[PDB]
Design a protein around this nucleic acid. Structure first.
Ligand code: DUR
Ligand code: URA
Lengths: 243, 245
DNA sequence: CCCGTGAGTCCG
DNA sequence: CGGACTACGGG
């Protein structure tokens, strides 16, 4: 599935490279272009067989995946526990306050540190997490307004969001079919809900569940995110598979 | 001789003057199927405007599921494809609202106005050659407008400033189209086109009759109870049934 | 982020 | 002379 999975991402990059954003959207980065190499290293190293479980995020945050090309790709955990590195280039148009520095980005993505710290504690080594699991985002683009502020797919005006999310809904169907996934875990309500509508519409044979999003913008994530999600994972019965 | 070429250059020149307008405010999207649906359009004019005409039917502007998809006036997909037998590649506008995508001849929707319009002529004439022997069909304005959520805006829903130069420019191209075609009689489909055409042709002193038929729009309840029956009677009264065997 | 409250569009 | 569906601010 590594090669097939990367083909789906390349075909999705092609359809997205034709969209045009505006309005409050002023910058659009695709790390699956300028951080293709560590992305493709992550997929070749960790996507070696079919998967039972897909964790699905919404999109890149500015300091993790936007820098490293790896879902929830906070720099220290990507460098040190996943052991993925690779050259990173730059978007053609950078916001000054959001330049791409790759594996030299000084900021920690809180969402990504939390997410990989959890699976690091639970699984020990990355091979144990990836025996049956994989992690991916619904949307590979990141968007800023004039002042460098992040607009998630949800903050896009409706006219710009429906366009984009229908194209990613279709790439998501293709991803789930190539990986053989039986269980999609939406990270946050938006991915959970989006994946469920999209997959049910194609009648793919797959169950869609959810865990809480780690984001620090989520006030409930700021006490005990790890403890709440260890309890959600136990309920979905995936701890089993993570040992 | 044959007006096809000249009709196209009229529309090509109107396309030019229009490409220069900036729209505002409530208007967020503007399409022009004469650019991205040029090929079926040009195929319809060449196939059916080979000779000079007695009557021009005139509509206001493309609807989102008829002419906006097929480039043919009142251009509901099934009738254009199966009755007029007009095909061509259709590409997309520069900027599309997600509720108003252009799918060309793959558009699954059947525009009610357009399906009504051509189904009348199909029943009345049999074959398209009979209807086009002396008639043709065109719109006053080739553009389509949408607000921020994809809702259609008619040319008259436009802020007066934009509305007036747009119509004035269309009026001018309409007077040429009428000259190029040779028509004795313009029938506006719906009130706006009838009135606008009367005001455009009288104001440049063209010696042409302007009449009217009810518009087939399902927004009008009288059209939903028996449009075809009303318009057959209106066409009788105008003496045009003889032209359409 | 997650949810609640509620306004634009369709009902051809 | 409503029903369903699907922006934005505060927790
Ligand atoms: O008893 C009544 C009658 C009417 N209406 C409102 C709703 C309806 O749309 C309109 C009259 O039919 O006024 C009510 O709320 N209650
Ligand atoms: O890659 C990422 C990072 C943050 N949040 C997500 O949903 N996915």
């Amino acid at each position: 599935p590594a090669d097939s999975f990367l083909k789906v991402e390349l075909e999705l990059n092609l359809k997205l490279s034709n969209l045009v954003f505006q309005d409050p959207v002023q910058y659009v980065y695709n790390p699956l272009v300028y951080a293709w190499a560590p992305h493709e290293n992550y997929v070749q190293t960790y996507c070696k067989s079919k998967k039972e479980v897909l964790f699905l995020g919404m999109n890149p945050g500015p300091f993790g995946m936007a820098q490293t090309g790896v879902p929830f790709g906070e720099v220290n955990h990507v460098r040190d526990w996943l052991q993925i590195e690779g050259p990173v280039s730059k978007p053609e148009v950078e916001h000054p306050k959001r330049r791409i520095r790759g594996f030299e980005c000084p900021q920690s993505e809180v969402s990504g540190a939390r997410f990989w710290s959890l699976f690091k504690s639970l699984c020990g080594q990355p091979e144990t997490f990836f025996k049956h699991c994989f992690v991916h985002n619904h949307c590979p683009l990141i968007f800023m307004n004039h002042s460098g502020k992040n607009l998630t797919p949800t903050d896009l005006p409706k006219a710009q969001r429906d366009t984009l999310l229908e194209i990613c809904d279709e790439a998501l169907c293709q991803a789930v079919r190539v990986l053989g996934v039986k269980l999609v875990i939406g990270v946050g309500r938006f991915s959970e809900q989006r994946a469920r509508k999209a997959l049910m519409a194609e009648g793919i044979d797959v169950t869609v569940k959810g865990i809480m999003h780690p984001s620090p913008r989520n006030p409930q994530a700021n006490k005990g995110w790890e403890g709440i999600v260890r309890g959600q994972l136990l309920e979905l019965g995936v701890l089993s598979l993570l040992t």
